[PDB]
Design a protein around this ligand. Sequence first.
Ligand SMILES: *[C@@H](C)CN1C(=O)CN(C[C@H](O)[C@H](O)[C@H](O)CO)c2[nH]c(=O)[nH]c(=O)c21
Lengths: 265, 98, 194, 242
Amino acid sequence: MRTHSLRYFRLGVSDPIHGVPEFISVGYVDSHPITTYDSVTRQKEPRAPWMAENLAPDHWERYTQLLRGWQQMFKVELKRLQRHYNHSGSHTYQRMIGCELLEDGSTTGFLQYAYDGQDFLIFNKDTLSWLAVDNVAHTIKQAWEANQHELLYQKNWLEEECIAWLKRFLEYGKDTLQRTEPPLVRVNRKTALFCKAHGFYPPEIYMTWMKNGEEIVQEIDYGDILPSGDGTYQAWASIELDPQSSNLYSCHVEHSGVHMVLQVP
Amino acid sequence: MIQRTPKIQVYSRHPAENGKSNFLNCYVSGFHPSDIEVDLLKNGERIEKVEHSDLSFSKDWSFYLLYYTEFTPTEKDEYACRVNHVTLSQPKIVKWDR
Amino acid sequence: QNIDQPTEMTATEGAIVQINCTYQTSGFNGLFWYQQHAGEAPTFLSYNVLDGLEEKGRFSSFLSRSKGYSYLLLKELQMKDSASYLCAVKDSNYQLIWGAGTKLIIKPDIQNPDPAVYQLRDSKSKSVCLFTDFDSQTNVSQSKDSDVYITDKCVLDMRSMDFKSNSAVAWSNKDFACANAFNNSIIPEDTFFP
Amino acid sequence: GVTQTPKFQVLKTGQSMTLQCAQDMNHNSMYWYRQDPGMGLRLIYYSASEGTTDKGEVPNGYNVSRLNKREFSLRLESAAPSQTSVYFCASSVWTGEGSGELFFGEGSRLTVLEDLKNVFPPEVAVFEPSEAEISHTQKATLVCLATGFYPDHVELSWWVNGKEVHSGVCTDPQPLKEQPALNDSRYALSSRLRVSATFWQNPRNHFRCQVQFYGLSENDEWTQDRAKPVTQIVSAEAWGRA
Ligand SMILES: *[C@@H](C)CN1C(=O)CN(C[C@H](O)[C@H](O)[C@H](O)CO)c2[nH]c(=O)[nH]c(=O)c21
């Protein structure tokens, strides 16, 4: 297989605009949203058909109740931060928890929080400690590190529960998460050389240009991997054609364990 | 409390060929906070039936969105995306340079 | 989804007892032990979520997530430790699953047994016989005739005198005498009937 | 701590009943459990946070109301014998925590009966220490008996010279039945208080055995001629002797 990830984000806004919810929690597997909850609907729902097809209603009922309390937890946490920061107005509290299952079977886990989109606190499941970015975080870290039991529980969930959850979802959406659609790669002229690739999943891809067999990272203008909106992705990389000279340029693409090369005449 | 302004890319689902129905995508990414407003312009005119993904989150605490609408390209038509954000006083327009 | 722990365990005063617990749950998010005395509120004792032994005073708690097994260990048992110990496990949905519990009985260390049966007369003249001071090894069985009543072993603590003794009460209306009281039980041979 | 009322209650099949529970600890989660012999605690309903409640494992015949952050009330819209149990209210700081431990109330014992006709307060008698025991052990052992009471809603205490004593006391944890054959049998319970024979021989010493019985409440209709078995205290006493 490839590497797969399970992530769970929470967003809190102190002064919501009409409609803009004051709590949103969305779950992802790799890049696919699987779950969503917000302060308005106040209920948790799947965002992928294979999530609903495979999870009993009592599951959604149960986690809906949990998220309601977690939404309340988040509201209070954000208040204390704003009080600590002596901040007023609208402010954002965020938290991302998740794990990775690698190709070789090794696992990773992470947990971190952010205030106004700023790295605030980062957990370390290998030292059972928190990393504070400023004094306000350290004050929170002092308290959080007190309940040594919670840190231990954190480690267990990240290392075991998260992976078990992620493995479960991988099978549930096998036909989508574990699929592969190879990219279609073409070369253009614009005057530079555009090596474009479209319609490929998974989204992770590597593209680069070679000068007769030697890469030039500095003089290559890469494009972002954008979503085509049909379930696949697209990306491109350009290079400047030296007019006073003439070399043999070639486009190289790596995607889902396949290496592919195109050569310019 | 540093804000991040959105990154607006305009492009199409598949390579553009006039006369064949395609999809036009506006990908607004890497902005903060989450309050954003996006519209798709047909020669400067708003497009009513425009769909968009739900808000989505990035590892670096930013957010991203995909506004997309069905269309058929013509050499006569020029297409661009209009986005307003808290980090923008003047709403920004990004043309689709194919 | 089940939790398994013994029903009753009896251990001697000052000894060590190890209450076992085995769990099978969809996910695991920690294993708790609660103490709950007779007719009392349960109280938290220990939480384990990673493998290994955790020690705190006389009590110690061990978890083996792989083996789906845990145990509460009580050292230097005291009479005050007689209670029920509740094994509870949190599942993948944070739902807390309670075991049936284990009732712990601490036998006092009868230092100088003085087995004997005495008769007490009604303050406002039934009548009762008292089996007291016997060794903790002895056990008392129910009566042989309905309409004849006996209570279980009972341990009192005269904390002022640092003295503890066992006792049981038998009474009836019939015919009924203190010598015939406890015939259904294995009584010490040197028991004294005045 | 966690306060839940009442400690005891007697209900006739088909009655309505509500249990009060409040927590001083500024917790967000509260729980209602029923503990029954043979099996572990079973959750009835739970309030993961203020303004939200959900069924537990056995939500039939019960309902709950998260009145505020502090109170979580449990209702029996119609009582049933299959509802006779001990109900514990608990709270925790949050749900979804790993190490979040529970905080239990004192517990509420309910006994639901077809009719209140069989509710009888205990009869309490006290037996003076045996003469043989005093001269053999230098210690006086008293015995107290509560007979013919129903249901098992008693709390036995010893009161030497007007102050409750705890040292040298042993009360049966399980009250045995007078007529074990019947399931509607009266219960009987015994207790022992032991003191130095010096204490017993002093006639200026007053010993009282108190049995607190929880029976019919203030708005319980009573008809039959025999006196209402309301919640009450029955005691028997004795003084020192030669
Ligand atoms: C809905 C089923 C998605 N979930 C989860 O399944 C669980 N989860 C993890 C939870 O935060 C921790 O394990 C616990 O608090 C200890 O750190 C979760 N978390 C979210 O923040 N949002 C979610 O939607 C979920």
